Amino acid sequence: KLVIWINGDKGYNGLAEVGKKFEKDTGIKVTVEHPDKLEEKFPQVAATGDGPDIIFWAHDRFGGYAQSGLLAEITPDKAFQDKLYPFTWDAVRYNGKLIAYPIAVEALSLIYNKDLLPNPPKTWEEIPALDKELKAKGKSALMFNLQEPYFTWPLIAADGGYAFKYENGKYDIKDVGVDNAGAKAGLTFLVDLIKNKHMNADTDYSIAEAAFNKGETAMTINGPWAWSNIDTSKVNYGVTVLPTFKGQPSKPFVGVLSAGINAASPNKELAKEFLENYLLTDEGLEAVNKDKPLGAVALKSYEEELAKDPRIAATMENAQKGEIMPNIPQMSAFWYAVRTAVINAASGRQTVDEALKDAQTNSSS
Numbered sequence: 001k002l003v004i005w006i007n008g009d010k011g012y013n014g015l016a017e018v019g020k021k022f023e024k025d026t027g028i029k030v031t032v033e034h035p036d037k038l039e040e041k042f043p044q045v046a047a048t049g050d051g052p053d054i055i056f057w058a059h060d061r062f063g064g065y066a067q068s069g070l071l072a073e074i075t076p077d078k079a080f081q082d083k084l085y086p087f088t089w090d091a092v093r094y095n096g097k098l099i100a101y102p103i104a105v106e107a108l109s110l111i112y113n114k115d116l117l118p119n120p121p122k123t124w125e126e127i128p129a130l131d132k133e134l135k136a137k138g139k140s141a142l143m144f145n146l147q148e149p150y151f152t153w154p155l156i157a158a159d160g161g162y163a164f165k166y167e168n169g170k171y172d173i174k175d176v177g178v179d180n181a182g183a184k185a186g187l188t189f190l191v192d193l194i195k196n197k198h199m200n201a202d203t204d205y206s207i208a209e210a211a212f213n214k215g216e217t218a219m220t221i222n223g224p225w226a227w228s229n230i231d232t233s234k235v236n237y238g239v240t241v242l243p244t245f246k247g248q249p250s251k252p253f254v255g256v257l258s259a260g261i262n263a264a265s266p267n268k269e270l271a272k273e274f275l276e277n278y279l280l281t282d283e284g285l286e287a288v289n290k291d292k293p294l295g296a297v298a299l300k301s302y303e304e305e306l307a308k309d310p311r312i313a314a315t316m317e318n319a320q321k322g323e324i325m326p327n328i329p330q331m332s333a334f335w336y337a338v339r340t341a342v343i344n345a346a347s348g349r350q351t352v353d354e355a356l357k358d359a360q361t362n363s364s365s
């Protein structure tokens with residue numbers, strides 16, 4: 001009776017273990033699913049009053065579901081809210097109402113093979129040279145998901161790109177920073193790495209992951225969820241600050257994996273009890289984190305154990321160098337516009353200037 005959607009890159013088996021712990025106490029079975037594009041499927045099935053009871057995604061998507069009336073306002077009392085970091089409640093704050101439970105805070109870091117690269121580059125600019133050392137050996141410096149703007153954004157933003165100008169605890173949807181000087185420098189650098197054969201326009205999550213995990217590439221760009229598979233692989237890896245660009249620190253967009261309750265769910269009390277009293281506990285999170293690391297968890301008591309982990313220290317350091325995603329409805333437009341921008345600039349279909357121009361138009365209008 002309890003159906004959960006969570007993306008395929010997350011700890012869905014650990015989450016089902018927490019769902020067994022629930023069935024044990026309530027008699028209610030939990031069905032964890034990981035459909036493709038589920039963030040895209042949700043507004044379509046919830047808009048007809050359909051979908052899962054609970055949906056897990058980064059908080060960025062949630063402003064849009066909320067103002068469309070697809071998410072239940074959640075009702076944690078103040079004692080429960082005191083359990084979690086204040087900024088993680090900020091992330092799910094839409095129009096002044098809490099619209100999801102925050103689970104974990106995610107930032108991309110640089111992941112490097114210590115065997116091939118004992119001292120990883122401090123800069124983007126030294127990557128070309130390193131690539132030339134590695135190639136001679138049949139290996140490459142760096143492979144990461146080029147298809148999703150999330151992975152390329154840290155670089156576009158370094159020298160001054162931004163999504164929506166942040167004013168007073170607010171956001172201006174007419175002021176988009178996707179087509180400024182810093183955005184152009186950033187995307188030009190990425191396009192120049194592809195042009196000079198240091199990376200390939202067609203590299204995706206799976207391709208990049210298999211290459212790093214097999215030891216074919218010295219580095220990758222990835223988040224906490226990815227470290228379990230690296231642990232299984234026998235690559236000896238470090239988790240560090242992203243390269244700087246033009247002497248500036250890469251600025252990843254920071255996501256707070258969050259759990260929304262479908263407004264059409266006839267099981268809202270069950271969903272509440274599951275999220276508060278099973279998932280968001282030291283035991284629940286550890287069942288999930290054990291499956292695929294979550295990053296810096298929202299739950300203070302569990303985060304203090306995780307915080308000592310140097311991979312977590314470097315995750316939080318990249319997070320502090322980047323920006324919390326907006327949750328406003330306009331984010332999916334912003335993301336679709338930067339997706340096409342980067343794809344088209346990588347492939348040659350548009351120059352950097354004309355790609356970022358059209359993204360600016362599509363992000364803001």
Ligand SMILES: OC[C@H]1O[C@H](O[C@H]2[C@H](O)[C@@H](O)[C@@H](O[C@H]3[C@H](O)[C@@H](O)[C@@H](O)O[C@@H]3CO)O[C@@H]2CO)[C@H](O)[C@@H](O)[C@@H]1O
Binds near residue numbers: 007
């Ligand atoms: O590019 C098209 C794509 O854009 C939007 O997706 C963005 C996500 O909503 C945003 O959270 C972020 O997603 C990353 C996850 O948060 C992270 O946990 C991990 O799973 O990697 C994701 C990157 O794949 O970034 C993407 C931007 O790439 C929009 O919501 C999507 O529906 C749309 O298909």
